[PDB]
């Protein structure tokens, strides 16, 4: 078949592929749209490979609950413009649904299942896209909280209604505890931190007997501030979350907080400097 502007348009309306990529694919395919699409599939893997070394520190956290089982998920891209795109969103929602339905906690299993769809999306969007991590939380009662696209939280609880779980998930989003209770902090970690603080206290000129007593106080502050129940409740900080839970005869058995780009150093850019370089 002849390669007309109309036919190219149809392959483009159909794939979102670049205009020239479409003309080239369609031409090599003698106008067979389905074959063009297949050609663009093999090309797309190479377009995606080109992008795969790009830092992707933007994107979304998503969460989904199915009864006693919840999934939290990070899917990265390079800019928040793509993080808001409907195609990127639908991809991340599709990955999320499959992780829940299949109870998939091994991100490599998830990656493998969606790699071709990832590549087709990257070939359209022109940004590196990565299924970065996935985790499950299991619980009697589960709730979630999304702080926009950037922070997601799952909370597992017992004896807590929907509103209380939600407020606790919001508290975790804001205050990022890494333990549930201060007693959960291991004796080993506490003793290491004790030594840190005693070292700092001593070199500041505090006599040893005084520094020791001060540091024992710092240890209670320390386990309190890294633990959920020891933290002041963000919606009423005159009480800890532990007091809140007692008031409701509830407890928390788990939580996970993901934040987009955690542990990724984001690429510093100076537009003005970069423009100057090119011209000179």
């Amino acid at each position: 078949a002849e390669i007309t502007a109309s036919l190219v348009k149809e392959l483009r309306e159909r794939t979102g592929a670049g205009m020239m990529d479409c003309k080239k694919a369609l031409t090599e395919a003698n106008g067979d749209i389905e074959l063009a699409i297949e050609n663009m599939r093999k090309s797309g893997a190479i377009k995606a490979a080109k992008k795969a070394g790009n830092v992707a520190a933007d994107g979304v956290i998503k969460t989904k609950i199915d009864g006693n089982y919840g999934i939290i998920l990070e899917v990265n891209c390079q800019t928040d413009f793509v993080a808001k795109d409907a195609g990127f969103q639908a991809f991340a929602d599709k990955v999320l649904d499959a992780a829940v339905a299949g109870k998939i906690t091994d991100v490599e299993v998830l990656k493998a299942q969606f790699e071709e769809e990832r590549v087709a999306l990257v070939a359209k969007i022109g940004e590196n896209i990565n299924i970065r991590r996935v985790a499950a939380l299991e619980g009697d009662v589960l709730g979630s909280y999304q702080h926009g696209a950037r922070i997601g939280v799952l909370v597992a609880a017992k004896g807590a209604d929907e509103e209380l779980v939600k407020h606790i998930a919001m508290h975790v989003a804001a205050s990022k505890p890494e333990f549930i209770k201060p007693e959960d902090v291991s004796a080993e970690v506490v003793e290491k931190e004790y030594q840190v603080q005693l070292d700092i206290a001593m070199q500041s000129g505090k006599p040893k007997e005084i520094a020791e007593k001060m540091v024992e106080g710092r240890m209670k502050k320390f386990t309190g501030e890294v633990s959920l129940t020891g933290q002041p409740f963000v919606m009423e900080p005159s009480k800890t979350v532990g007091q809140l839970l007692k008031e409701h005869n509830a407890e928390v058995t788990g939580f996970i907080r993901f934040e987009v780009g955690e542990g990724i150093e984001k690429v510093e850019t100076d537009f003005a400097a970069e423009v100057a370089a090119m011209s000179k």
Binding site: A5, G16, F81, K84, A174, V234, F271, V275
Partner: protein
């Protein structure tokens, strides 16, 4: 003292926004002589930023970066628009960019004119879908790179783009050409002269004999200017940017107060309820250490004074963390002179913890 125009580039990473901007500076310097870039046409001075992130652009717009008078949408003709191109245009629509010019890049890589046409028509359609005038939009066909390398044919298209910056973006309005407005900082009476208000003329010109309205906080009043003075020296007029004392006929000391504005009659109104875009400082920027919630009841600092207001968070939003930027609807406890684009600080206990811009006046 040529006009100042703020522009910016928006487009897909890799479509050539940095290269285009370098080509603009290079060719304009070559032709007319000599974080942001600057360049000049015979009649206009340009300040040019890039728009790499949605939230970053909205935040910079709120925290002081002057708004774009026009944007250059850069789309490589090889691809045509990306799926996220509607998110680029949607940002433009969100922040009220009043004009968008399109530079079709990489046309040195495309021979089929009918394909360039298809790309052009897709862009016009996208623009129109978000109420930019797609049919009337200037679209330049160029090569950022080949122009940067000094190719004559392609240099022309850079000059064509600069031509549209000149002709399609209206000369922005100078402060002094705008209707008179003065934010009132202090008020006193002079025995034999009468009431004097002081402040910095924000826009326009006030002359002896002209009527003014006193607007905000309390019911609007009208008066006549019987004198303008600077450093105890009498002037015939006060101009935008000057610190002055404006003498007023009839009106008394206790009938005017700080936070009101003097204005040309009929040109600014008092309002209590408005939509805004807001940015809450992070802890490191000296802001709050903790989030706030629906009952947060801060002060909104307009020009010279705090006004308490209550807030309505957008649907699905129940918490605002330091460093967040969000839309909010604000209802002040009494009216203040305002229009779209007015900037304000958000304060608590007299300390600035945020910034906003009025996006739409409601009531």
């Amino acid at each position: 003292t040529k006009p100042h125009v703020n522009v910016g580039t928006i487009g897909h990473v890799d479509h050539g926004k940095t290269t285009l901007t370098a080509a603009i500076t290079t060719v304009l310097a070559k032709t007319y002589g000599g974080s942001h870039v600057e360049y000049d046409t015979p009649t206009r001075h340009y300040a040019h930023v890039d728009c790499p992130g949605h939230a970053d652009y909205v935040k910079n717009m709120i925290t002081g970066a002057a708004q774009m008078d026009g944007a250059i949408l850069v789309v490589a003709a090889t691809d045509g628009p990306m799926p996220q191109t509607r998110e680029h245009i949607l940002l433009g629509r969100q922040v009220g960019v009043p004009y968008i010019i399109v530079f079709l890049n990489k046309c040195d890589m495309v021979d089929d004119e009918e394909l360039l046409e298809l790309v052009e028509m897709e862009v016009r359609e996208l623009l129109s879908q978000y109420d930019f005038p797609g049919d009337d939009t200037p679209i330049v066909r160029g090569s950022a790179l080949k122009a940067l390398e000094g190719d004559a044919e392609w240099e022309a298209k850079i000059l064509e783009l600069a031509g549209f910056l000149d002709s399609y973006i209206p000369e922005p309005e100078r402060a002094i050409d705008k209707p008179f407005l003065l934010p009132i900082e202090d008020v006193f009476s002079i025995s034999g002269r009468g009431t004097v208000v002081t402040g910095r003329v924000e826009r326009g010109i006030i002359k002896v004999g002209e009527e003014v309205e006193i607007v905000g906080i309390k019911e609007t009043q009208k008066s006549t200017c019987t004198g303008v003075e600077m450093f105890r020296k009498l002037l015939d007029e006060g101009r935008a940017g000057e610190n002055v004392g404006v003498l007023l006929r009839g009106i008394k000391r206790e009938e005017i107060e700080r936070g009101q504005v003097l204005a040309k009659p009929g040109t600014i109104k008092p309002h209590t309820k408005f939509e805004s875009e807001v940015y809450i400082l992070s802890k490191d920027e000296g802001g709050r250490h903790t989030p706030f919630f629906k009952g947060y009841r801060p002060q909104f600092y307009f020009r010279t004074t705090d006004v308490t207001g209550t807030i309505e968070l957008p649907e699905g939003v129940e918490m605002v963390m330091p460093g967040d930027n969000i839309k909010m609807v604000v209802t002040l406890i009494h009216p203040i002179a305002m229009d779209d684009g007015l900037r304000f600080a958000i304060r608590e206990g007299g300390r600035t913890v945020g910034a906003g811009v009025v996006a739409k006046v409601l009531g």
